[PDB]
């Protein structure tokens, strides 16, 4: 995965949860890609 690190100066903004949800798409993307590389063909 990636580090759980987000912009602290952007917390004063309204899109902190927006960047947070973009980051969890990115992490699920990385996990799904690693799973597709590791898994074989049934």
């Amino acid at each position: 995965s990636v580090s759980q690190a987000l912009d602290a100066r952007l917390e004063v903004g309204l899109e902190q949860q927006a960047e947070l949800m973009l980051k969890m798409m990115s992490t699920l993307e990385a996990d799904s890609i690693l799973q597709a590389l590791t898994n074989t063909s049934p």
């Binding site: 917390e11 004063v12 903004g13 309204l14």
Partner: protein, 94 residues
Amino acid sequence: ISGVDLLVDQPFTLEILTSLVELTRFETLTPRFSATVPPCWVETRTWKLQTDSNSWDEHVFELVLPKACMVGHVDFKFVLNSNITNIPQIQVTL
């Protein structure tokens, strides 16, 4: 309310859009505001919750600003339990 020079009918000049963007920023409140909570929480302000089931159904926090001004927004930060295995159905309403 009529007889006011609005900010909509003007053409898209650079200075009017720049003033609109510079308007839409937000600032931090200073000095400290006022707030009270039920006593199950012990201690920009923070609290820690203690396991009390006397008023677990409802919780009411009261907030009084130091001055009546232009309300930008309210930031509500929370940290949950580390052993959570299911998404809780808990709501917070202003």
